[PDB]
Amino acid sequence: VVNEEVAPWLDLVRKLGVLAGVLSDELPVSLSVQVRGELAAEEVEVLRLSALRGLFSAVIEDAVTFVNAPALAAERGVTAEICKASESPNHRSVVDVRAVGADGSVVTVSGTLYGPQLSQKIVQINGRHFDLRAQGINLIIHYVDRPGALGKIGTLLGTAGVNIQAAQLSEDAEGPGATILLRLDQDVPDDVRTAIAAAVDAYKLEVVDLS
Amino acid sequence: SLPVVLIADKLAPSTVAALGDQVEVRWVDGPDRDKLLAAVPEADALLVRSATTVDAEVLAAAPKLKIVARAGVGLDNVDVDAATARGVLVVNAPTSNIHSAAEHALALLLAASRQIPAADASLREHTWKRSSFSGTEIFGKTVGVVGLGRIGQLVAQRIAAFGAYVVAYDPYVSPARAAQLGIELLSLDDLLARADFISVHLPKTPETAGLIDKEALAKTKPGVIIVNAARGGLVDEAALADAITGGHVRAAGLDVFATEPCTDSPLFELAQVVVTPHLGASTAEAQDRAGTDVAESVRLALAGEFVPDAVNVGGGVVNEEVAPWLDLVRKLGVLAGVLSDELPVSLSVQVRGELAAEEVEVLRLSALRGLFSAVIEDAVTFVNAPALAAERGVTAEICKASESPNHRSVVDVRAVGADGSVVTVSGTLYGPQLSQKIVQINGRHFDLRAQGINLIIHYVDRPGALGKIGTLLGTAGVNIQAAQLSEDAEGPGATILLRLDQDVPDDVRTAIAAAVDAYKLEVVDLS
Amino acid sequence: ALALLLAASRQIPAADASLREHTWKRSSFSGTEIFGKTVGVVGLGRIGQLVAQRIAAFGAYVVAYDPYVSPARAAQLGIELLSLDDLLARADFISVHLPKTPETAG
Amino acid sequence: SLPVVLIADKLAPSTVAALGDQVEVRWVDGPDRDKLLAAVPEADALLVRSATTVDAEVLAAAPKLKIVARAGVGLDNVDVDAATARGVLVVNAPTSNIHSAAEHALALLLAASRQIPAADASLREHTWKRSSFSGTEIFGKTVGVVGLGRIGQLVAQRIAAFGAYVVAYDPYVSPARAAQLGIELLSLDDLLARADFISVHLPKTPETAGLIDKEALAKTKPGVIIVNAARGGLVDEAALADAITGGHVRAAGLDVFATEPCTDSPLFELAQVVVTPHLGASTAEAQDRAGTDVAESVRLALAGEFVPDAVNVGGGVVNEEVAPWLDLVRKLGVLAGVLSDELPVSLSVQVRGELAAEEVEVLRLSALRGLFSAVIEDAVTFVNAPALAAERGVTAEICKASESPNHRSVVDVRAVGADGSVVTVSGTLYGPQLSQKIVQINGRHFDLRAQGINLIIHYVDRPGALGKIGTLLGTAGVNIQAAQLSEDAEGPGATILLRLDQDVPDDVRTAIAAAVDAYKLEVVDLS
């Protein structure tokens, strides 16, 4: 039995997996799922599968099933780990999916669920904090903070007929950079991604479907 | 072992008899550094006026000091930050001068309209220039009071008995309260247009400074008489001089100056401007009231009772768990105030989650302090809730709930309007540094540093709005540190909040408004 | 009458003068507060009646000497009627006025 | 000589320990006439529940009786008029049942939606009819609370934790207060349309009686469940029965009946209606709270202190000069309330002239009692101002002024709205009989008996209006005793007030409105 407390997290952690993957430039060699807070008292093994399954759909043709995935990860040299800690520093419960590349680079993505609807929310990308619905087409940009930056991103999207349903932009604690997330009403043509990316000096720019 | 109360400035024992006979009162020459520092070591309480300075050095030499009390209203001679840092309760006497100061405003209004000092001078010179003078009758006239706190209220009441109609401008008094006072509340523009007399009664804050400038002085009634017994440079001194000379304002009374110790204002060369050297509180009765007020405050303090005239936090008065929440809640009040169309009648402070297990009444006061900070002076952290309710018409309450939907603890500050609408703003602290985060505004969720200059825009024209907004800000040279924006759940509206690296010029505000078609455009400094 | 009571109470002329000769003698002045004091009005013809109502609004108690004024009218102006002697004993401020009976005024 | 406290009904000493040891408590069998009358002569205080009747005979036999206290909420068994007449303070325990009664409303809501009594009965009969039952979930549903006083507030709060949205109808709660409660205020029509559950929480007054009739029951949502744990016939019993049978309302819970001792309601023949014999307060905890409340009240009374739970006037508590002003001021509150567009946030009571020399705080309470009398029960003359402010959002203050412009003494009751507008109504007493006169409404002056049915009309079509109004009233057979009417100082409006000899039918009201083109048409009984 997947426990009633645990079930609603499945689809979320899958999406954190999708996110950790699209956001990794190279296929990760390790995937680590950390369960913190109230959730940590449940049986969350199945969330490791969920994350992996998410990781691999973002990379491999013909999406993975649930018993399909562990062997598929092993076969591609990806190892998975799961941690459970009662202690969560901020949210009552949060899950972090951490993907480490062969070159040692790290991507963490975190999600929670709260409210009467148990709405799924993305709440961290790499130590930047957010509260955005885990749904729809989301554009992620890590860029160089110059005057004009946010405007150029907005000008180009709008110029392309692409409407922004929500968006949140945080500034790096100790960097020259900034990272924004935008939920869009439709995909962004390649040409326009390249444009956004040159207009700001994007380290990273990805679009991901969180349906 | 009776607690020691050290009087460092010139307060007589009789002034201070409200301290029990349960204490040992001593006296010291406070201005004299070596004496003060020699005597302060054994002090439990330290009372002071203005001659003595209670800076860090004094505090560091006073190891068991529990209250610093200033018999007065200014806190200029007390480093309140340092006293807070060391756990020292600071107290003053905030209503001790209101009558002597109201009366002085009235004194100046009348002296100016009847040209008293000049007349008295003409007889002093041994001549009879009766024919040359010409006063202004108050009866039947309109008097504009700018700022309706305790003193402006006292002035309104006195002036009304002269058969003047009174109007006021004060966005920090509720309409019901002004109507209880029998005072009509106006836009500053409307006050300016209508007033035969203007008396200013604002505190000095950057929101206030120079309020009445050349542009304001030009909107007044020809023949107006203006009084400022309140603060520093509320009326632009040069604009005043110009309009006096030029004829437009007939007379004026000033008791306070842009920069005090002031012996050289050009206003001193105009006969039709009555001036006085910051008298207002200069009165045996006011100086006694100060002394006896502060004496009672020290009494309660030592008796381990609640000190309503507290200006700060010190002692067990706040748990270590709660302390860091004060400043954040202050900022929720500021923000709830800014997002409100007009002054809320009440603030509902809701504490949810782990925090709810704490003793959190001080937070209700923090919310109020923030809401009202456009009319509160920097040093003061605490406000007298019962006084603020009675003076201005606004209350606060606190509610607890075990459950917090998302974060372990969250505070929500619900600002409620007379008409029943609500503006909700929430925050948390989290992490090693316990950094302050704004997490909800009106059902919208996010995670933004509670700090810096923030631009908030409610608007109706959606497509490309991010583009327009960012591009105008960026063309103005304004960096955007962070941002949150979403399309309204119901209706054609959208809302963005941006943290900026500087303020936003007025023309650019107007541009942004026009471009996204805003109905609300605000900029609050969340420091 | 109010203007003068206030100008004398706060030493306005002497305080305005000191400024005009470019000195800051704040510490030389020391006014008298009206609030809560007892004001004696001598004579209650109309101007005195008006003075007393204006002074009441400063939160002062008003006594007056005028033996020909309607006692009901005095009460309505919130005035306690006294003999001249008693007024003089109790008065912190005194304003003298044309009385109701024009020159039995002493 | 210790004062005697006589307990005439079944209250245990422990219930009453809040009376000091400074008193001699005795007990008597109150229902037993001869015993009661034998014991009451030495009584200083008399406590009672409901079994004993404190009528004139009892009072006349109790020469030094100072308080009659009813441990409960009803005053049915106490002749309060007679006690007032003899100077006897009457007291009850007005918040002593609110929890047990809220809980019972909830009990009934749940029992009705889950068909408990019938289910329990089916198992009692030794069969398993699980398949036949079908409950109604509360989560996510809309619950309409009709009347938002203490109990409706407690019910709203309990029901909200079940994840129901709560709406209320109560014209005697301010919007700010309802919003502090997190409750949405609605017209009765809108509540009816939206509510899946309705719980009634009105007092019985003629303004209230039968509120929810056939016409209301027909506007509700199909499938609604209705509870009345409040009062008598607030929901028309026959209309209810019809709508239950007819299907439209799914279920109901009743704890009170149009005419009690009730053993024969047709509702008792419907399974889908849960009924209980006026339990609600029937609880050890509620009966104890009553006893200990009333005991404290008696304590304060004897200690010559202020009794907040007073229901009336007795003793020196009111000067002989002031006494006759109570009733008139009550009527100024009623009228200020009626002439107000919506509930004022505060009443400013201004006492001018000779009266201002008196001690007149009770008048501020009289004004409140009048303002709120649509939700106050007859016997009660006094209201608990602090309680009413906290529960409903409305305050009162009193101001004095030596001068009265015209009459020797006048009271003005200023009703102030949240938006700052003011409605002013004044009265005097004058003459041998000290007859009560209404003398001003909103700057208009006149002299009209404060008595009888009065029609007030604000209207915009002036020429011939007197003709139209009088002719319609007269065709309806309505005599006009007195009248005052004037054309508004500024604008196209006019105002008439008429004292009539009976009420005015609804069609004739509509006719008058149409004919003079009214915006305000009201009829208040100024008895």
Side-chain angles (χ1 to χ4, degrees):
Chain A
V1 214
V2 184
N3 187 57
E4 358 198 300
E5 284 279 340
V6 176
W9 295 81
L10 288 177
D11 184 52
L12 211 224
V13 183
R14 179 178 73 67
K15 299 178 177 171
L16 300 168
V18 177
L19 251 16
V22 183
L23 253 38
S24 268
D25 36 300
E26 291 296 331
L27 180 75
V29 304
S30 45
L31 191 78
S32 185
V33 184
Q34 290 119 17
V35 172
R36 328 189 47 98
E38 294 174 25
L39 228 205
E42 317 276 356
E43 291 167 39
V44 293
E45 248 313 309
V46 77
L47 292 182
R48 199 190 84 252
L49 313 171
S50 269
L52 238 16
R53 163 146 170 256
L55 211 241
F56 284 115
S57 63
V59 167
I60 293 153
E61 238 177 31
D62 205 87
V64 207
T65 83
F66 247 57
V67 283
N68 179 340
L72 179 87
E75 158 187 284
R76 274 114 190 317
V78 173
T79 55
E81 132 176 282
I82 176 144
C83 306
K84 296 208 295 151
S86 57
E87 174 76 21
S88 185
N90 151 47
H91 302 274
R92 285 225 255 144
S93 299
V94 66
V95 183
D96 317 318
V97 167
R98 177 154 128 131
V100 188
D103 63 325
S105 55
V106 198
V107 172
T108 317
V109 158
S110 326
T112 33
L113 318 169
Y114 63 80
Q117 306 313 336
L118 288 168
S119 321
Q120 296 163 16
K121 305 277 190 99
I122 295 109
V123 296
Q124 187 191 290
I125 307 254
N126 278 305
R128 282 7 251 137
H129 300 92
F130 293 101
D131 195 316
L132 275 178
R133 257 149 143 189
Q135 99 193 6
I137 295 130
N138 295 260
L139 157 67
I140 296 104
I141 309 164
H142 189 207
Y143 69 92
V144 164
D145 191 49
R146 258 183 255 74
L150 181 43
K152 285 198 241 291
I153 299 166
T155 296
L156 285 163
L157 259 349
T159 293
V162 174
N163 294 292
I164 300 160
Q165 295 180 345
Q168 309 184 359
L169 152 74
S170 333
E171 90 171 319
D172 294 349
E174 19 170 340
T179 127
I180 190 186
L181 227 94
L182 304 95
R183 194 183 40 269
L184 275 13
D185 71 328
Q186 80 191 283
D187 213 1
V188 193
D190 265 316
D191 279 7
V192 175
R193 295 177 190 194
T194 301
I196 292 157
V200 298
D201 260 73
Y203 308 98
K204 208 143 237 306
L205 189 152
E206 304 289 338
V207 182
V208 37
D209 197 319
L210 254 24
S211 289
Chain B
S1 220
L2 273 349
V4 179
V5 182
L6 226 205
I7 325 274
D9 278 326
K10 261 101 124 159
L11 291 135
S14 63
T15 287
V16 111
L19 307 163
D21 69 290
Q22 265 344 291
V23 296
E24 195 206 330
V25 198
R26 318 176 162 155
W27 268 270
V28 68
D29 191 15
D32 192 306
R33 284 318 276 185
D34 289 331
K35 302 259 189 279
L36 203 204
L37 268 29
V40 92
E42 307 190 288
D44 287 79
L46 169 78
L47 338 188
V48 102
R49 245 156 125 217
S50 34
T52 297
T53 72
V54 182
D55 50 15
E57 187 189 22
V58 166
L59 287 151
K64 61 192 192 137
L65 216 237
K66 289 132 83 162
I67 329 108
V68 163
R70 209 261 211 200
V73 194
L75 284 152
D76 265 73
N77 62 325
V78 190
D79 187 357
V80 179
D81 273 358
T84 291
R86 307 233 353 171
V88 176
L89 207 96
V90 173
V91 98
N92 64 356
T95 58
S96 87
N97 72 355
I98 64 183
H99 296 109
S100 285
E103 283 164 23
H104 195 67
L106 266 299
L108 249 24
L109 198 153
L110 291 160
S113 354
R114 303 309 276 277
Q115 307 173 273
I116 308 310
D120 183 288
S122 64
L123 300 181
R124 242 32 115 142
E125 252 156 337
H126 309 118
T127 16
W128 187 257
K129 252 105 341 125
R130 174 172 189 189
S131 76
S132 317
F133 298 102
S134 210
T136 298
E137 193 153 295
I138 291 155
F139 181 90
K141 297 290 182 62
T142 287
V143 168
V145 179
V146 177
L148 240 201
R150 278 316 288 287
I151 297 152
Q153 294 186 26
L154 294 180
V155 168
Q157 271 153 215
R158 290 137 182 72
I159 205 62
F162 286 75
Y165 313 92
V166 171
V167 310
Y169 162 73
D170 192 324
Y172 295 86
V173 174
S174 77
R177 167 86 189 123
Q180 280 165 36
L181 291 157
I183 306 192
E184 164 177 21
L185 273 193
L186 293 184
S187 75
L188 177 52
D189 274 339
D190 280 356
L191 188 139
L192 263 13
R194 285 229 246 138
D196 299 288
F197 308 77
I198 301 167
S199 189
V200 322
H201 295 298
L202 290 179
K204 200 152 139 226
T205 67
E207 284 109 330
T208 258
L211 225 219
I212 275 111
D213 47 17
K214 156 149 336 245
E215 309 145 9
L217 260 9
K219 278 153 138 171
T220 53
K221 262 216 201 159
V224 70
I225 289 164
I226 310 296
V227 177
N228 185 14
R231 229 72 211 77
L234 274 16
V235 187
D236 194 275
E237 274 167 25
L240 221 219
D242 282 352
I244 285 289
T245 301
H248 186 68
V249 358
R250 184 170 342 238
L254 275 213
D255 170 57
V256 281
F257 304 91
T259 181
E260 255 154 59
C262 185
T263 53
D264 56 339
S265 184
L267 294 173
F268 301 171
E269 255 69 67
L270 302 152
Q272 56 277 79
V273 172
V274 180
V275 292
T276 45
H278 207 151
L279 283 5
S282 291
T283 259
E285 297 80 354
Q287 293 317 294
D288 289 358
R289 206 110 77 269
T292 78
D293 279 351
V294 108
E296 171 74 10
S297 276
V298 165
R299 195 188 66 76
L300 298 158
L302 294 174
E305 232 171 318
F306 174 61
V307 174
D309 288 332
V311 166
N312 77 338
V313 155
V317 57
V318 181
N319 208 263
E320 239 191 73
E321 292 292 326
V322 176
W325 290 88
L326 276 33
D327 189 49
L328 161 72
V329 173
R330 191 175 56 58
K331 299 175 176 165
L332 301 177
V334 167
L335 229 26
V338 175
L339 299 162
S340 281
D341 290 336
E342 80 252 335
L343 218 234
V345 261
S346 58
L347 298 182
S348 237
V349 189
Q350 192 153 234
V351 178
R352 315 235 274 266
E354 295 181 8
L355 187 47
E358 292 304 313
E359 164 57 59
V360 297
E361 282 283 331
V362 295
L363 299 183
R364 154 184 110 74
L365 308 175
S366 286
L368 281 171
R369 210 249 87 130
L371 179 58
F372 282 93
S373 56
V375 303
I376 302 194
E377 255 141 279
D378 268 319
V380 201
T381 271
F382 181 100
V383 272
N384 186 343
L388 156 81
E391 163 198 38
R392 282 183 184 280
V394 182
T395 54
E397 45 156 48
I398 271 262
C399 312
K400 309 213 213 156
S402 327
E403 201 173 11
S404 174
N406 174 25
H407 310 270
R408 285 174 38 204
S409 289
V410 69
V411 173
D412 309 308
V413 167
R414 282 162 57 82
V416 356
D419 69 350
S421 67
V422 182
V423 162
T424 291
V425 175
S426 331
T428 4
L429 307 176
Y430 63 67
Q433 319 285 171
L434 288 170
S435 41
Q436 306 159 4
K437 299 298 205 130
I438 298 151
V439 298
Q440 129 149 189
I441 290 172
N442 289 328
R444 295 118 186 132
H445 298 102
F446 44 91
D447 201 297
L448 276 216
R449 267 179 242 165
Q451 82 169 45
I453 284 123
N454 292 257
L455 160 54
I456 295 128
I457 304 163
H458 294 28
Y459 64 102
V460 151
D461 184 8
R462 305 214 281 223
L466 193 35
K468 303 178 196 186
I469 297 159
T471 300
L472 297 156
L473 254 1
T475 282
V478 180
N479 272 279
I480 304 187
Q481 300 180 346
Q484 168 265 331
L485 77 297
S486 52
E487 83 183 3
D488 291 346
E490 38 151 328
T495 60
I496 179 176
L497 183 171
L498 309 88
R499 184 197 328 128
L500 307 187
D501 79 324
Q502 65 204 287
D503 200 352
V504 185
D506 259 341
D507 36 286
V508 316
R509 296 201 199 189
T510 294
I512 293 182
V516 295
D517 193 357
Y519 47 98
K520 199 166 185 77
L521 189 310
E522 246 96 48
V523 179
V524 50
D525 178 49
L526 264 205
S527 266
Chain C
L2 268 285
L4 279 160
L5 196 151
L6 288 154
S9 284
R10 304 311 285 267
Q11 321 171 262
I12 300 296
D16 175 286
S18 46
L19 260 7
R20 307 240 174 229
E21 57 219 344
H22 321 98
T23 74
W24 185 261
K25 261 130 92 95
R26 170 174 170 161
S27 68
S28 323
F29 301 98
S30 188
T32 297
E33 198 180 64
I34 291 167
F35 180 68
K37 298 298 177 42
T38 283
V39 179
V41 177
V42 176
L44 282 188
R46 200 44 186 156
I47 289 156
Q49 309 190 10
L50 290 192
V51 168
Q53 300 208 280
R54 269 129 254 246
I55 270 282
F58 295 75
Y61 308 102
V62 181
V63 300
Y65 169 66
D66 192 320
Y68 294 99
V69 62
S70 177
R73 155 85 45 118
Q76 295 254 343
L77 318 153
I79 297 197
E80 157 182 21
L81 293 185
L82 295 177
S83 66
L84 180 48
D85 264 0
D86 293 336
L87 172 150
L88 271 354
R90 276 170 65 172
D92 303 295
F93 299 76
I94 303 184
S95 191
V96 306
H97 287 283
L98 300 185
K100 194 75 186 129
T101 287
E103 212 93 285
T104 183
Chain D
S1 220
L2 273 349
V4 179
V5 182
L6 226 205
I7 325 274
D9 278 326
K10 261 101 124 159
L11 291 135
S14 63
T15 287
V16 111
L19 307 163
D21 69 291
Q22 265 344 291
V23 296
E24 195 206 330
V25 197
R26 318 176 162 155
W27 268 270
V28 68
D29 191 15
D32 192 306
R33 284 318 276 185
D34 289 331
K35 302 258 189 279
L36 203 204
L37 268 29
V40 92
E42 307 190 288
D44 287 79
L46 169 78
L47 338 188
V48 102
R49 245 156 125 217
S50 34
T52 297
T53 72
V54 182
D55 50 15
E57 187 189 22
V58 166
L59 287 151
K64 61 192 192 137
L65 216 237
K66 289 132 83 162
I67 329 108
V68 163
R70 209 261 211 200
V73 194
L75 284 152
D76 265 73
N77 62 325
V78 190
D79 187 357
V80 179
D81 273 358
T84 291
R86 307 233 353 171
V88 176
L89 207 96
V90 173
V91 98
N92 64 356
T95 58
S96 87
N97 72 355
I98 64 183
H99 296 109
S100 285
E103 283 164 23
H104 195 67
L106 266 299
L108 249 24
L109 198 153
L110 291 160
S113 354
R114 303 309 276 277
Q115 307 173 273
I116 308 310
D120 183 288
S122 64
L123 300 181
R124 242 32 115 142
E125 252 156 337
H126 309 118
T127 16
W128 187 257
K129 252 105 341 125
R130 174 172 189 189
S131 76
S132 317
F133 298 102
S134 210
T136 298
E137 193 153 295
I138 291 155
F139 181 90
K141 297 289 182 62
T142 287
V143 168
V145 179
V146 177
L148 240 201
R150 278 316 288 287
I151 297 152
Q153 294 186 26
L154 294 180
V155 168
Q157 271 153 215
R158 290 137 182 72
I159 205 62
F162 286 75
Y165 313 92
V166 171
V167 310
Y169 162 73
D170 192 324
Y172 295 86
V173 174
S174 77
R177 167 86 189 123
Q180 280 165 36
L181 291 157
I183 306 192
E184 164 177 21
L185 273 193
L186 293 184
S187 75
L188 177 52
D189 274 339
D190 280 356
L191 188 139
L192 263 13
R194 285 229 246 138
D196 300 288
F197 308 77
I198 301 167
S199 189
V200 322
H201 295 298
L202 290 179
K204 200 152 139 226
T205 67
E207 284 109 330
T208 258
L211 225 219
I212 275 111
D213 47 17
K214 156 149 336 245
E215 309 145 9
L217 260 9
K219 278 153 138 171
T220 53
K221 262 216 201 159
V224 70
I225 289 164
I226 310 296
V227 177
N228 185 14
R231 229 72 211 77
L234 274 16
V235 187
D236 194 275
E237 274 167 25
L240 221 219
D242 282 352
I244 285 289
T245 301
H248 186 68
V249 358
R250 184 170 342 238
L254 275 213
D255 170 57
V256 281
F257 304 91
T259 181
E260 255 154 59
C262 185
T263 53
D264 56 339
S265 184
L267 294 173
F268 301 171
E269 255 69 67
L270 302 152
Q272 56 277 79
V273 172
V274 180
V275 292
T276 45
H278 207 151
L279 283 5
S282 291
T283 259
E285 297 80 354
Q287 293 317 294
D288 289 358
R289 206 110 77 269
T292 78
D293 279 351
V294 108
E296 171 74 10
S297 276
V298 165
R299 195 188 66 76
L300 298 158
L302 294 174
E305 232 171 318
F306 174 61
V307 174
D309 288 332
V311 166
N312 77 338
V313 155
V317 57
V318 181
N319 208 263
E320 239 191 73
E321 292 292 326
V322 176
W325 290 88
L326 276 33
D327 189 49
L328 161 72
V329 173
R330 191 175 56 58
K331 299 175 176 165
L332 301 177
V334 167
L335 229 26
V338 175
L339 299 162
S340 281
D341 290 336
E342 80 252 335
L343 218 234
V345 261
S346 58
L347 298 182
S348 237
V349 189
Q350 192 153 234
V351 178
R352 315 235 274 266
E354 295 181 8
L355 187 47
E358 292 304 313
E359 164 57 59
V360 297
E361 282 283 331
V362 295
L363 299 183
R364 154 184 110 74
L365 308 175
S366 286
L368 281 171
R369 210 249 87 130
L371 179 58
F372 282 93
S373 56
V375 303
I376 302 194
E377 255 141 279
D378 268 319
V380 201
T381 271
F382 181 100
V383 272
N384 186 343
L388 156 81
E391 163 198 38
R392 282 183 184 280
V394 182
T395 54
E397 45 156 48
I398 271 262
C399 312
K400 309 213 213 156
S402 327
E403 201 173 11
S404 174
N406 174 25
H407 310 270
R408 286 174 38 204
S409 289
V410 69
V411 173
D412 309 308
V413 167
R414 282 162 57 82
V416 356
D419 69 350
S421 67
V422 182
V423 162
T424 291
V425 175
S426 331
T428 4
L429 307 176
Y430 63 67
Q433 319 285 171
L434 288 170
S435 41
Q436 306 159 4
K437 299 298 205 130
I438 298 151
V439 298
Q440 129 149 189
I441 290 172
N442 289 328
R444 295 118 186 132
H445 298 102
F446 44 91
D447 201 297
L448 276 216
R449 267 179 242 165
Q451 82 169 45
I453 284 123
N454 292 257
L455 160 54
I456 295 128
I457 304 163
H458 294 28
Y459 64 102
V460 151
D461 184 8
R462 305 214 281 223
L466 193 35
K468 303 178 196 186
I469 297 159
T471 300
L472 297 156
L473 254 1
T475 282
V478 180
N479 272 279
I480 304 187
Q481 300 180 346
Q484 168 265 331
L485 77 297
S486 52
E487 83 183 3
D488 291 346
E490 38 151 328
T495 60
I496 179 176
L497 183 171
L498 309 88
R499 184 197 328 128
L500 307 187
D501 79 324
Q502 65 204 287
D503 200 352
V504 185
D506 259 341
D507 36 286
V508 316
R509 296 201 199 189
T510 294
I512 293 182
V516 295
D517 193 357
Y519 47 98
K520 199 166 185 77
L521 189 310
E522 246 96 48
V523 179
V524 50
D525 178 49
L526 264 205
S527 266

